[PDB]
């Protein structure tokens, strides 16, 4: 692995930031800064930290299909620094629950 990002467009894909409502997790307003980098790449990310339980609050990662599950916000630090050589770190919420 020498070439940095080759398969598919390196920028502009799909992102979504919507915290559930646990009153805490990792980041809320700070992610707006770490995501500002990937937000200006060409994709789309809405840094919003709500607190309403309507099964409609989740955070989707770049190139991540199915908006049903959820991933960690720190994913950016691993997606921007590691590119995509650490999928095990998706630390996404299972499909069952």
UniProtKB/Swiss-Prot annotation:
The organism's superkingdom is given as: Eukaryota
Sequence intervals crossing the membrane: none
Compartments reported by the entry: Nucleus; Chromosome, Telomere
Q: What does this protein do?
A: Essential regulatory protein in yeast whose DNA-binding sites are found at three types of chromosomal elements: promoters, silencers, and telomeres. RAP1 is also involved in the regulation of telomere structure, where its binding sites are found within the terminal poly[C(1-3)A] sequences. The opposite regulatory functions of RAP1 are not intrinsic to its binding sites but, instead, result from interactions with different factors at promoters and silencers. RAP1 mediates repression of the HM loci and telomeres by recruiting the SIR complex.
Provide the assembly information. Answer: Interacts (via C-terminus) with RIF1. Interacts (via C-terminus) with SIR3. Interacts (via C-terminus) with SIR4. Interacts with a GCR1 homodimer.
Q: Which family does it belong to?
A: Belongs to the RAP1 family.
Q: What name goes with this protein?
A: DNA-binding protein RAP1
């Amino acid at each position: 692995e020498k070439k940095e990002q080759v398969s598919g467009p390196p920028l502009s894909n799909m992102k979504f930031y919507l915290n559930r409502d646990a009153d805490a997790h990792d980041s809320l307003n700070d992610i707006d800064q770490l995501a500002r980098l990937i937000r200006a790449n060409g994709g789309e990310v809405l840094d919003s930290k709500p607190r309403e339980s309507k099964e409609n609050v989740f955070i989707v990662s770049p190139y991540n299909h199915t908006n049903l599950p959820t991933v960690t916000p720190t994913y950016i630090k691993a997606c921007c620094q590691s590119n995509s050589l650490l999928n095990m770190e998706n630390y996404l919420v299972p499909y069952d629950n």
